[PDB]
Amino acid sequence: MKNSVSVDLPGSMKVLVSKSSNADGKYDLIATVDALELSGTSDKNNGSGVLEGVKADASKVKLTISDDLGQTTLEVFKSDGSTLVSKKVTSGGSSTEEKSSGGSSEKIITRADGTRLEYTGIKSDGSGKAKEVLKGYVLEGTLTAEKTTLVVKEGTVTLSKNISKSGEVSVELNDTDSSAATKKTAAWNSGTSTLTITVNSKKTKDLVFTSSNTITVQQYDSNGTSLEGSAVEITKLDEIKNALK
Numbered sequence: 001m002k003n004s005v006s007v008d009l010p011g012s013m014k015v016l017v018s019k020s021s022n023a024d025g026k027y028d029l030i031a032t033v034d035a036l037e038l039s040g041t042s043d044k045n046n047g048s049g050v051l052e053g054v055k056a057d058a059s060k061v062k063l064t065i066s067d068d069l070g071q072t073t074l075e076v077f078k079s080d081g082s083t084l085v086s087k088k089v090t091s092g093g094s095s096t097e098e099k100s101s102g103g104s105s106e107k108i109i110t111r112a113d114g115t116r117l118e119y120t121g122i123k124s125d126g127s128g129k130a131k132e133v134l135k136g137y138v139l140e141g142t143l144t145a146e147k148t149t150l151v152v153k154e155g156t157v158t159l160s161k162n163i164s165k166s167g168e169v170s171v172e173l174n175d176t177d178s179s180a181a182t183k184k185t186a187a188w189n190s191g192t193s194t195l196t197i198t199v200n201s202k203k204t205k206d207l208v209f210t211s212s213n214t215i216t217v218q219q220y221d222s223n224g225t226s227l228e229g230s231a232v233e234i235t236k237l238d239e240i241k242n243a244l245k
Contacts, residue, residue: 001030007047009065011072011090015047031063033074038063059085066091104128115213117163119143132161134213137237152237154244157184161209169209171195173244184244197243198224205243206231217243 004016018028022041029040029051038061042049051063058079065072071091077084086099093112098105105122115134122128126145131138139161141150148163156176163169173186173195184204186197195207202224208216208231217239218231234240 001028004028004030007069009047009069009072011074011088011095013063013072013074015051015063015065017042017045017047021045033061033063036061111213113213117148119148134215136235137240139237152240152244154241157244159240159244169193171207171209173197207243215240 001016001018003019005019007015007017009015013031013033015029015031021027026041026043027045027049029038029042029047029049031038031051033053036053036055038051038053040049040051040063044067047069048065048067050065053061055061055076060077060079060081062075062077063072064075071089074088074090075084076086085101086097088095088097095108095110097108097110100106104120105128107117107119107122109117109119111117113135115132118131118133120129120131122143126143128143130141130143130148130150132140132148132150139150139152141148141160146165150161150163152159158174160172160174161169162171168190170190171186171188173184175184177183181200184197184199186195188195193209193211195209196203197205197207202222203220204224205220206218206227208218210216215234216231217234218227219229220226221228234243
């Protein structure tokens with residue numbers, strides 16, 4: 001690989017591809033990931049293809065680079081190469097890291113902005129524990145094969161952020177408050193990703209769940225009909241609880 005060319009890949013990796021092909025028309029590939037050298041051959045000249053290596057503990061490693069360089073898959077197998085232990089797929093600014101070990105699985109999704117969904121203790125029915133890691137705070141809850149449900153409790157109010165298997169966010173609020181004068185109810189608008197809270201037949205605040213994986217809160221005037229001021233981004237879990245008081 002004396003006169004190879006270096007190619008940047010998703011997942012903060014680099015591959016070297018030979019400048020010209022062998023007698024079969026194929027290009028040599030070399031990459032180093034952490035301590036491990038990987039090597040392969042490809043029928044393309046751009047850095048795409050498959051590289052393989054073996055760790056010191058005899059685990060087999062495969063790096064698969066998609067044809068257009070938009071995706072990398074980094075896989076680790078047991079020493080015979082049959083049983084997959086871990087798989088990291090990176091593309092479009094996001095990574096998904098899956099590991100299966102000792103009865104349960106894990107899946108960590110890292111979004112382009114650094115926020116994460118962490119699914120742990122995944123069982124054969126698709127259930128598990130769920131955490132969303134946002135900037136400044138974490139939301140915790142559960143996973144089923146149908147949805148992720150992340151829960152914040154304040155007083156008799158329970159706020160539930162649902163993420164469907166498809167990735168669609170919806171939010172609900174349920175309040176066990178006996179008193180009809182203080183009980184919170186809320187309505188969800190999927191068109192604006194906004195939960196509007198009502199108390200005593202007047203709107204009190206809008207909670208917006210943004211495409212940037214943030215939450216903002218904005219109050220209504222005492223008339224219960226017009227918004228006032230400007231929306232404030234939540235920076236810590238305590239401020240979500242404050243919005244539920």
